[PDB]
Amino acid sequence: MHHHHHHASKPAPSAEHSYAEGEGLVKVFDNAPAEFTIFAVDTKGVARTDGGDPFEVAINGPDGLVVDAKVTDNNDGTYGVVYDAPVEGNYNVNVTLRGNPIKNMPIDVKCIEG
Numbered sequence: 495m496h497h498h499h500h501h502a503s504k505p506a507p508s509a510e511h512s513y514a515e516g517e518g519l520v521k522v523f524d525n526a527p528a529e530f531t532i533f534a535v536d537t538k539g540v541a542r543t544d545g546g547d548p549f550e551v552a553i554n555g556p557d558g559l560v561v562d563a564k565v566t567d568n569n570d571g572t573y574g575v576v577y578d579a580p581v582e583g584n585y586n587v588n589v590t591l592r593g594n595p596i597k598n599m600p601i602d603v604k605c606i607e608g
Contacts, residue, residue: 497570499544507547509596511535514589518563519601522579523608532565532573532589541571550590551575555605556583563587579605
């Protein structure tokens with residue numbers, strides 16, 4: 495298994511070295527919850543070799559719709575995220591890594607009340 499906890503220390507994810515992808519960064523709905531994936535590297539260019547780094551996918555919708563998209567480790571150097579949209583409108587997404595910011599953010603994603 496490539497992703498494994500060998501030892502009691504961990505390298506850190508980085509701004510050049512974490513990037514995310516899928517349906518939950520294109521289109522999101524009411525009764526269809528949406529999903530996408532965090533693709534993390536510390537620095538060593540190969541995927542992250544062990545899990546449970548801390549992340550945040552904190553998002554604003556129109557006015558009062560302050561949301562965070564829930565993160566779960568896949569155990570392979572990636573993370574599934576999920577979130578859902580009450581509204582015809584737009585979500586505004588910011589990701590963060592041990593509560594420290596990164597490149598290419600915030601970004602935007604169409605919400606529809608399906």
